[PDB]
Write a structure and sequence with these properties.
This is part of a larger assembly, with two copies of chain A (798 residues). Chain A is α/β, with parallel strands linked by helices. Helices cover 47% and strands 8% of the residues of chain A. Chain A contains 34 helices and 15 strands. In chain A, helix 1 crosses helix 6. Chain A is flat and about 110 Å long. At the A-B interface, helix 10, helix 13, helix 15, helix 26 and helix 28 of A face helix 5, helix 20, helix 24 and helix 37 of B. Chains A, B: InterPro entries: AAA+_ATPase, ATPase_AAA_core, Clp_ATPase_C, Clp_N_dom_sf, Clp_R_dom, ClpA/B, ClpA/B_CS1, ClpA/B_CS2. Chains A, B: GO terms for molecular function: ATP binding; ATP hydrolysis activity. Chains A, B: Belongs to the ClpA/ClpB family. ClpC subfamily. Chains A, B: This is Negative regulator of genetic competence ClpC/MecB.
């Protein structure tokens, strides 16, 4: 394990001491027991001293069970009995929440292993084994502090507090207080809104997702002394805990009955504070599938102030309360809880370190915690600023902890061997062939010590991680799903985007710089990390950059939404997607676009071919580009604050699909180039209204379909083929030469660049399969596809 | 606390005196105990006197504790123990109602403090700790208020009043029933309509939400004493509560059975009055899901005149029940319950001043109450004109009480210091470094008393508040939502509307004066408190004033609806803007327009382009402006009663969106102006149909792009950028000079003033992120964006 208390460790070594002192050169449980009592009067030792066992009494018994002498100090270590007692003790401290293991637990574990020599020692010296395990437990368990005693009060409190529930005020007078770090400025604003008797109900709106609950412990403190008014003193804060309500309930009627009981006791009115977390569920308002309607009792209660309560709500929730104005608006009144500022994130992260140090990585590295924050606003980008954060931390706060125990130095070969020994040995004795197992046995246990010696030399991988979450690591984990390898991803985004988009350097650099500015963790998420228009017609490199943006920008290929503007005109998907004349935009705003981005807020959102849609759609979208939010889909709020908005457009097609070739000269090629590098940048404005486009962070231009583009199309198709074949376990690569023979059947002037897929099928798929079937090449072998002197040739390598 | 009775206080001071008299210059609880009994025969004192203890007996133990000497004082104050006894008594009086703590509670609090100097004195002088708390409980005094009674009897009346649900008359025969302030004129209207034995059912219709419930106590008082019909003499008034019915029930079948029992009990018939609040739920008729249908039993009960009852329903509720008929018709007959208005408001406030003087804030300030009302009407706006009001007083009626208990004068620094002391001291002794903690220890308590002395200088913040809710406070609290900084918001409304609409003063003053006059409670509170038409082009000042109106009239810009009337005739979009529009005028009345304002009555409702709308829509808008309410959309009533209805126009647009050119003059922007401050007053007649438009309270005038508005548009856009960045905690400001560098890229003759957003991104957004990235500027540093040499310049400021 690692991380134990003194008393424990001390009890353990004393066994070995007695090993030799009593002649039992192997420390069985008799010596562990002895160890407990030989630590004198520690919790183990002391326990044994209660039941009637001196250090003396044990070692003599111990000595009477393996005899004396048989010593020579022949490698006096534990044996498996003694090892069992230890395995148990660790859990006997885990049980008590200890991330350490002390004396008590060692006797507790000893008892657990209540057969073997220890067991016989205690049962011979007039001590019942469980009487001993009792005794240790009831002295001390886990080590902790923060406690106080003396004091009682109140009578009226009786009916309420039984039910349902713990009283927040209590635990902070018990010296079990936790701050909890908010979101401090929120707490002050509650008491104006609370110590009323007319609209006395606060309602906190933020995100889930801010750690709302942090603000709440604030209240506790102020409710005691003295901020709340003079005869509004003697306030108590009772939380209406959902967990207690569901407990003992198994029906809708029963759930209502529990709420009724709370309401009946609520007669403590106007001087009682009820805390309702996630307020919406009880009101049941809004939606097409509302929640249980507590609202009938709650509405007059809220208005009366008998239910003088505090509501904890989020981004979306509020709409469904102001709709039932005013008795949840003659009660309600709002106060601002953050869309978390970066700094608030950091302190939460730091706070939860020691328990990811139970996953034993984090605590630390500092920059890496910071990485969780800084990286989260732009890179994942999938929740709210602290939820995101902590995930980056702990993922990496385990990732390396996984990398930890993979090998000894490289002495993984030792373990492999030690296995092989057993086999030889075993089967040889199974014939017997006594000594024909023997030397193999001897070789085995030799091996074993080497194995274990260099695997606990890979305690260096513990000291590596067991306080470190790595900079690069936190970032790496953020890159993995969807500091260093996110900020290297950020800084070098352009480098990453160039390796997957061939041509359209114009486009790449434009996205790169706009995203990288935002993406440096220096732009608030409340607008896409990049808004963009991706110009050129379909087939010019637009989408491919969006994809490449997911890889570079997000650190993995994952997360890309994609919405068609052409459907929001009912004439390109009015009969390819279900609906009628009064549909299509209602599907997009009302459902598709907003729902999709709620799943991954990260996503490169591609609202394609924006010319086709009328400009009116663009106004709706415009709110996405500016605000970073839309509220649609039954009042849900979708964070496009983390998205990259990419609007593609119907731009310039004729040149921007024109190929090089010789049209008049060998300078018709260099006139497809210069011409395409002109044609995007004037065609863009014609493909849309300006109102959409200005709220876009750089206007990305993608140019033509050169000749030159043909051999780039072959290299897009062949790579998609060979990769879907990788799941089989085929490792394939195409040389440029092999893409050339494929081009031989697709330099058609009359059928374009379409035949290339078919010719890839013929020359790659079909050819690889015709080489695998013959056993010329194999799966797992790396397969190079080349053309030799004009004819394609398939070669194999490792 | 703030309130205690003599006996309590007397017990307390006597403790200190006896402390030192016996040689204890620290007043232990041992002296508090002594104190209790040294106050002779008060309930604490008496209690101890029962158990066999005199003040003498206590002091003897006390002298056997510290004893002589310690009569040299210590500036004798309490012990931490003694401070505990006081905190406990407070709760020991709360639990017995009392928030004006008496003697009993002090001995009770001693018991509570069941370990300590007292505790052991009392447990040493041979009396149980609990025998003492008993004795105090079993005699009360200073927990009552004086009421009447001298005997109790009943007859046939027994089964009914038991059940379910208590009678107003009983508590008013003890003469402890409240008036209530009301809604007094409402009570009168009942007595023809109720003292029938036929259609004897009054049915109160108002806002809920106005204090309808006030009227009910009205009846109680007048049916008892003393001049009323012989009809209403020989009657009983019984209140029926929904809460009791639901209690002990969790199914519909059980609820009906209980209701059957009630119906049987109506056998007090033709002389019994049943009060049913929220009457509608029981009849169960109408709706899309109705409610539980008591009506089968209840309907003949009303017809027979056995059930003579009082119905409490709201604006909207009634229609689908008189729709049932005709014993419903021969039951009900209507009476007017207060529709929210300013004069009525004030009277409620004043009435509940003294009762929110439980908050030692409000009662009063007079100006503050009036303000609460007047301010509420304009600044949220959402609720009802008197509910809003009382909430501000009580809101504020804690708000300054918060500012109370957080001051030392500026000696907040003391507390900070006193902490630091402990640290030094503590850590030093932990090394020990005994006297190296000592002097630090001594320095601590020097500080401490000084600290505490200046924390109790903030009894001056009590003397501020304990009957004065602060005028300014009410305003602050309304500003918290959305007199002084709301009536300065009101008075200076014009100034406030002017500051966000630059130019177009013509418009500003027109809106300003009409609302600012009106909202002082001097214009109809059942019609939009300003109606306006906003003419101009599309945009340019129109909407922007509506926003500025929200701020000035309502307190923040977040008080602005905005609905397009052209959708309520729709013939443009159906799949690119809005989902399912057909039915169109029906869509607005029947649903959408009304629903939106029903969400927020706290809004400048801006109904755009009623000019380009079906003629029915203008009629619909006309109802909003006249009635102030519309009842549609499931028979719900939408209060436009504290909205500002603003109907927009843009049929003169071209001149009103014209731009300056030279031609012959550089006074061409100021000749684009002169044309436009004319062009609106001609766009009115051309736009609309007359029947609607004339209800408008002023014709609001706007302008164009000119040369001149353009450079004002750059300053609107740059502010949208910097503000969404504030959320992360970037403090940004642009000087005019940086907005100038941006303008450099968007004063095109042929690409509009649309490029300005994009160029704001390049020169502001992009620039801030590229200045944060190199560490020149920072979050929470105020960041000035300038030009100072014809090129951009980065400054830092606090």
């Amino acid at each position: 394990f690692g991380r134990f208390t003194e008393r424990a460790q001390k009890v353990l070594a004393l066994a070995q001491e007695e090993a030799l002192r009593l002649g039992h050169n192997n420390i069985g449980t008799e010596h562990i027991l002895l160890g407990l009592v030989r630590e004198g009067e520690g919790i183990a030792a002391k326990a044994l001293q209660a039941l009637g066992l001196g250090s003396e009494k044990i070692q003599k018994e111990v000595e009477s069970l393996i005899g004396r002498g048989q010593e020579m100090s022949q490698t006096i270590h534990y044996t498996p009995r003694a090892k069992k007692v230890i395995e148990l003790s660790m859990d006997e401290a885990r049980k008590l929440g200890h991330s350490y293991v002390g004396t008590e637990h060692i006797l507790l574990g000893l008892i657990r292993e209540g057969e073997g020599v220890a067991a016989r020692v205690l049962n011979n010296l007039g001590v019942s084994l469980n009487k001993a395990r009792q005794q240790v437990l009831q002295l001390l368990g886990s080590n902790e502090t923060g406690s106080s005693a003396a004091g009682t009060n109140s009578n009226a409190n009786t009916p309420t507090l039984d039910s349902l529930a713990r009283d927040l005020t209590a635990i902070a007078k018990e010296d079990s207080l936790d701050p909890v770090i908010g979101r401090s400025k929120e707490i002050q604003r509650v008491i104006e809104v609370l110590s009323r008797r007319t609209k006395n109900n606060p309602v906190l709106i933020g995100e889930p997702g801010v750690g709302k609950t942090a603000i709440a412990e604030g209240l506790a403190q102020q409710i005691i002394n003295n901020e709340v008014p003079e005869i509004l003193r003697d306030k108590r804060v009772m939380t209406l805990d959902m967990g207690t309500v569901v407990a003992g309930t198994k029906y809708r009627g029963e759930f209502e009955d529990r709420l009724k009981k709370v309401m009946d006791e609520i007669r403590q009115a106007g001087n009682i504070i009820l805390f309702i977390d996630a307020l919406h569920t009880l009101i049941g308002a809004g939606g097409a599938e509302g929640a249980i309607d507590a609202s009938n009792i709650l509405k007059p209660s809220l208005a009366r102030g008998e239910l003088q309560c505090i509501g904890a709500t989020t981004l979306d929730e509020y709409r469904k309360y102001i709709e039932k104005d005013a008795a949840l608006e003659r009660r309600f009144q709002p106060i601002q809880v953050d869309q978390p500022s970066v700094d608030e994130s950091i302190q939460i992260l730091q706070g939860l370190r020691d328990r990811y140090e139970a996953h034993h990585r984090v605590s630390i590295t500092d920059d890496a915690i910071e990485a969780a924050v800084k990286l989260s606003d732009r890179y994942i980008s999938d929740r709210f600023l602290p939820d995101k954060a902590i995930d980056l931390i702990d993922e990496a706060g385990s990732k390396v902890r996984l990398r930890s125990f993979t090998t000894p130095p490289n002495l993984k070969e030792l373990e492999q061997k030690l296995d092989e020994v057993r086999k030889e040995k075993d089967a040889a004795v199974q014939s017997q062939e006594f000594e024909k197992a023997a030397s193999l046995r001897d070789t085995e246990q030799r091996l074993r010590e080497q194995v274990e010696d260099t695997k606990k030399s890979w305690k260096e991988k513990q000291g590596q991680e067991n306080s470190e979450v790595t900079v690069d690591d936190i970032a790496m984990v953020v890159s993995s799903w969807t500091a260093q390898t996110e900020t290297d991803k950020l800084l070098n985004m352009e480098n990453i985007l160039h390796s997957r988009v061939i041509g359209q350097d114009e486009a790449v650099v434009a996205v790169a710089k706009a995203v990288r500015r935002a993406r440096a963790g220096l732009k608030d998420p409340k607008r896409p990390i990049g808004s963009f228009i991706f110009l050129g017609p379909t087939g010019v490199g637009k989408t491919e950059l969006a994809r490449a943006l997911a890889e570079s920008i997000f650190g993995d290929e994952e997360s890309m939404i994609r919405i068609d503007m052409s459907e929001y005109m009912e004439k390109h998907s009015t009969s390819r997607l279900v609906g009628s004349p009064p549909g299509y935009v209602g599907y997009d705003e009302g459902g598709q676009l907003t729902e999709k981005v709620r799943r991954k807020p990260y996503s490169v959102v591609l609202l394609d071919e924006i010319e086709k849609a009328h400009p009116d759609v663009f106004n709706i979208l415009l709110q996405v580009l500016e605000d970073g939010r839309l509220t649609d889909s039954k009042g849900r709020t979708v964070d496009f604050r983390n998205t990259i908005l990419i609007m593609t457009s119907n731009v310039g097609a004729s040149e921007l699909k024109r190929n090089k070739y010789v049209g008049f000269n060998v300078q018709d090629e260099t006139q497809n180039h210069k011409d395409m590098k002109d044609k995007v940048m004037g065609e863009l404005k014609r493909a849309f209204r300006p109102e959409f486009i200005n709220r876009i962070d750089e206007i990305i231009v993608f140019h033509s379909l050169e000749k030159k583009h043909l051999t780039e199309i072959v290299s897009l198709m062949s790579d998609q083929l060979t990769k879907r074949l990788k799941e089989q376990d085929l490792s394939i690569e195409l040389t440029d030469a092999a893409k050339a023979k494929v081009a031989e059947e697709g330099v058609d002037l009359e059928y374009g660049a379409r035949p290339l897929r078919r010719a890839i099928q013929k020359h790659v798929e079909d050819r690889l399969s015709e080489e695998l079937l013959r056993g010329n090449i194999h799966k797992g072998q790396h397969i190079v596809l080349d053309v030799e002197d004009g004819e394609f040739v398939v070669k194999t390598t490792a």
